[PDB]
Structure formats: structure tokens, C-alpha cells
Coordinates of C-alpha atoms and ligand atoms in Angstrom, one line a residue:
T8 CA 53.2 -74.2 9.8
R9 CA 51.0 -72.9 6.8
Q10 CA 50.3 -69.6 8.7
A11 CA 53.6 -67.9 7.3
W12 CA 51.8 -68.0 3.8
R13 CA 48.5 -66.6 4.7
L14 CA 46.9 -63.3 5.5
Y15 CA 43.7 -61.9 7.3
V16 CA 41.8 -59.3 5.2
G17 CA 39.1 -57.5 6.8
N18 CA 36.4 -54.9 5.9
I19 CA 36.1 -56.3 2.4
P20 CA 33.4 -54.9 0.1
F21 CA 30.1 -56.4 0.3
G22 CA 29.3 -59.2 -2.5
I23 CA 33.1 -59.2 -3.6
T24 CA 34.2 -62.7 -5.3
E25 CA 37.2 -64.8 -4.2
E26 CA 38.3 -64.2 -7.8
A27 CA 37.8 -60.6 -7.7
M28 CA 39.7 -60.2 -4.7
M29 CA 42.6 -62.6 -6.0
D30 CA 42.8 -60.5 -9.1
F31 CA 42.8 -57.2 -7.1
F32 CA 45.9 -58.4 -5.0
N33 CA 47.9 -60.0 -8.0
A34 CA 47.5 -56.8 -9.8
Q35 CA 48.6 -54.5 -6.9
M36 CA 51.6 -56.9 -6.1
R37 CA 52.8 -56.7 -9.5
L38 CA 52.4 -53.1 -10.1
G39 CA 53.7 -52.1 -7.1
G40 CA 57.1 -54.0 -7.6
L41 CA 56.4 -56.6 -4.7
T42 CA 56.0 -59.7 -6.7
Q43 CA 59.3 -61.8 -6.7
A44 CA 59.0 -64.1 -9.8
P45 CA 56.6 -64.7 -13.0
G46 CA 53.0 -65.8 -12.3
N47 CA 50.6 -65.0 -9.5
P48 CA 51.6 -64.6 -6.1
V49 CA 48.2 -65.1 -4.5
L50 CA 47.2 -68.8 -5.0
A51 CA 43.7 -68.5 -3.5
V52 CA 41.4 -66.6 -1.3
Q53 CA 38.7 -67.7 1.0
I54 CA 35.9 -65.3 2.0
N55 CA 33.5 -65.2 4.7
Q56 CA 30.6 -63.3 3.3
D57 CA 28.7 -63.3 6.5
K58 CA 31.6 -62.2 8.6
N59 CA 33.1 -59.9 6.1
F60 CA 36.5 -61.0 5.9
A61 CA 38.9 -63.1 3.7
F62 CA 42.0 -65.0 4.0
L63 CA 44.6 -65.0 1.1
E64 CA 46.9 -67.8 0.7
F65 CA 50.4 -67.0 -1.1
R66 CA 53.0 -68.8 -2.7
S67 CA 55.9 -67.9 -0.7
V68 CA 56.7 -66.6 2.8
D69 CA 58.3 -63.5 1.3
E70 CA 55.5 -62.4 -0.6
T71 CA 53.2 -62.9 2.2
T72 CA 55.2 -60.5 4.3
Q73 CA 55.5 -57.8 1.6
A74 CA 51.7 -58.0 1.2
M75 CA 51.3 -56.6 4.7
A76 CA 52.4 -53.4 3.0
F77 CA 49.1 -53.1 1.2
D78 CA 47.2 -52.6 5.0
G79 CA 44.7 -50.0 4.2
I80 CA 44.4 -50.1 0.4
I81 CA 41.1 -49.0 -0.6
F82 CA 39.1 -51.6 -2.4
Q83 CA 35.7 -50.6 -3.7
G84 CA 35.4 -47.8 -1.4
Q85 CA 36.7 -49.7 1.7
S86 CA 40.0 -49.5 3.8
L87 CA 41.3 -53.4 3.7
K88 CA 42.5 -54.7 6.9
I89 CA 45.4 -56.8 6.2
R90 CA 47.0 -58.7 9.5
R91 CA 48.8 -61.8 10.4
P92 CA 46.9 -64.8 11.2
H93 CA 46.6 -64.9 15.1
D94 CA 48.5 -68.2 15.3
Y95 CA 51.4 -66.8 13.1
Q96 CA 54.6 -66.9 14.8
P97 CA 58.0 -65.6 12.6
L98 CA 60.5 -68.0 12.4
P99 CA 63.7 -67.0 13.9
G100 CA 65.9 -64.9 11.7
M101 CA 63.0 -64.0 9.6
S102 CA 61.5 -60.4 9.6
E103 CA 57.9 -60.4 9.7
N104 CA 57.9 -56.7 8.5
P105 CA 57.3 -55.6 4.8
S106 CA 60.6 -53.9 3.1
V107 CA 58.5 -51.9 0.3
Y108 CA 56.6 -49.0 0.6
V109 CA 53.1 -48.7 -1.7
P110 CA 52.9 -45.2 -2.6
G111 CA 49.4 -43.8 -1.3
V112 CA 48.6 -46.6 1.0
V113 CA 47.7 -45.4 4.4
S114 CA 47.9 -47.9 7.1
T115 CA 44.8 -48.5 9.3
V116 CA 46.7 -49.2 12.5
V117 CA 46.5 -45.9 14.6
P118 CA 48.1 -46.6 17.8
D119 CA 47.3 -44.2 20.9
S120 CA 49.8 -41.5 20.7
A121 CA 50.2 -37.9 21.4
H122 CA 48.6 -36.5 17.9
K123 CA 46.4 -39.2 17.4
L124 CA 42.9 -37.5 16.2
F125 CA 39.4 -38.4 16.9
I126 CA 36.9 -37.2 14.6
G127 CA 33.4 -37.7 15.5
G128 CA 29.8 -36.6 14.0
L129 CA 30.5 -37.8 10.4
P130 CA 27.6 -38.5 8.4
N131 CA 27.2 -42.3 8.0
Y132 CA 26.7 -42.3 4.0
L133 CA 30.6 -41.6 3.7
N134 CA 32.7 -44.5 3.0
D135 CA 36.3 -45.0 4.0
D136 CA 37.7 -43.5 0.9
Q137 CA 35.7 -40.3 1.2
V138 CA 36.5 -39.6 5.1
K139 CA 40.1 -40.2 4.3
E140 CA 39.9 -37.9 1.5
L141 CA 38.5 -35.4 3.9
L142 CA 41.2 -35.7 6.2
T143 CA 44.2 -35.9 3.4
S144 CA 42.9 -32.3 2.3
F145 CA 44.8 -31.0 5.5
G146 CA 48.1 -33.3 4.7
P147 CA 49.3 -36.7 4.3
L148 CA 48.1 -39.5 6.5
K149 CA 50.3 -42.0 8.5
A150 CA 47.4 -43.9 9.5
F151 CA 43.6 -44.0 9.6
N152 CA 40.6 -46.1 10.6
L153 CA 36.7 -45.3 10.0
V154 CA 34.8 -47.3 12.7
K155 CA 32.2 -49.5 11.3
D156 CA 29.4 -51.7 12.8
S157 CA 30.8 -55.2 12.8
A158 CA 27.4 -56.8 12.1
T159 CA 25.8 -54.5 9.4
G160 CA 28.9 -52.8 7.9
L161 CA 27.4 -49.4 8.5
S162 CA 29.7 -46.5 9.7
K163 CA 29.5 -45.5 13.0
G164 CA 30.0 -42.0 12.1
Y165 CA 33.5 -41.6 14.0
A166 CA 37.2 -42.1 12.9
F167 CA 40.7 -41.9 14.1
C168 CA 43.7 -40.6 12.5
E169 CA 47.5 -39.7 12.8
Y170 CA 49.1 -37.2 10.0
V171 CA 52.4 -37.7 8.7
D172 CA 53.5 -34.2 10.2
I173 CA 52.3 -33.7 13.6
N174 CA 51.8 -30.1 13.0
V175 CA 49.0 -30.9 10.8
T176 CA 47.1 -32.2 13.6
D177 CA 46.2 -28.7 14.8
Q178 CA 45.4 -27.5 11.3
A179 CA 42.9 -30.4 11.1
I180 CA 41.1 -29.5 14.4
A181 CA 41.0 -25.9 13.1
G182 CA 39.6 -26.7 10.1
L183 CA 37.0 -29.4 11.1
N184 CA 36.0 -29.1 14.9
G185 CA 32.6 -27.7 15.4
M186 CA 31.7 -28.0 11.9
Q187 CA 27.9 -28.4 11.4
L188 CA 26.0 -31.1 9.2
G189 CA 22.5 -31.3 9.6
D190 CA 22.0 -32.6 13.2
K191 CA 25.5 -33.4 13.8
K192 CA 28.5 -31.5 14.6
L193 CA 31.8 -32.4 14.2
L194 CA 34.2 -33.2 17.5
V195 CA 37.8 -33.1 16.5
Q196 CA 40.6 -33.3 18.9
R197 CA 43.3 -35.4 20.1
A198 CA 41.9 -38.9 20.7
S199 CA 43.3 -39.0 24.4
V200 CA 40.9 -36.0 25.4
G201 CA 38.0 -38.0 25.3
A202 CA 38.9 -41.7 25.4
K203 CA 36.5 -43.6 27.5
Ligands
LIG301 NA1 31.5 -58.8 10.8
LIG302 NA1 32.8 -53.7 7.0

């Protein structure tokens, strides 16, 4: 099954070409020490421009798995969402999880948990990178996602995150909750408090 050689990439920059995406991933894999031989690990990229996602095709199962470590990497201001194809199943005795860490890359997977934060009231002109930088001021992030409209790509003005250090959570709340920005006022609280 070809699905062990392919990844979904969501939240791609508008107007990006398949070649630009391929060059980005091939370079990052090499610069990060993930590539396992001479030559390019990514063989092809198929972009769905209207739906805002791509699929990457890799030359090996192992390099496909390692590339999962790039989930959340910023590309032209956007956090790339890297995921397995929905019809992927690991073969027995194979780990589906990457074994290398990429410095500075913050996962987009923010599970509901004790210290998961909601940040509402963000100006909609801030991209994923700038909201991430706002939050990183308080301490390193374990995970982060800025919510966007799936049809237009515009920020919906709220995000979720998890700090590496659970104790930074209350520091970010103290520094950001109630902050006024024009007509908006930030609400920063554990996401469990106001989850619908
Ligand atoms: Na879309
Ligand atoms: Na988007």
C-alpha cells in the first residue's frame, strides 16, 4: 500500500507551487539530519490549491515517518499541518512515530488536557507565526494551533496552545488575559473553562 510513502500537508501558503514545497521539504530534511541517503527524499508534491492542502510522496517508508517530525513547521508564515493519510495503517513491527526532533518546530497537535490554553480575541491580521511568537515570549511551546476559516484561510481570531512547562500557563494568563486591542479584549484561560 502506497500510503506508507505519503503524507498530508495542510494549511499551505496561498499560491505556493509544488516545486517550492518539494524544495522546502528536501532542504529541511537534509538540514535537520533526517535524510537517510544521497538524493532527494521527497519525490513529488500534489497540491490542491482550492482546498489548501498537499500530499507529499517520499522514496522510503522510514523518511516518510521521520518527516512527521516537521508537523507545525512555519513556511511563509503558516504552521504546516503534517498528518498521515486517513487510510494509512502501520505494518506490524514498524513504529509510526518519528525518532528525531527538529529544534524550534512546535507541533500543531494540542490535545485537550489540564493546561491546554484558549486564546481568544486575536486580531485577524496576525498569521500563525506572529501568534506563535506572542505566546513563545512567555516560554517554549509544546504545541500550538491558530484556528482559520477553512474556506477563506483567514484567521478566526483564536488559538490553542500548550507550554512545555505547565507553570508557564499561569504566567501567560496573567500577561495576556484582558488585554485590549481596539474593539477586542483577549480572553486567555484554560480551554476546559469555556469549551462548548
Ligand atoms: Na480549505
Ligand atoms: Na489555511
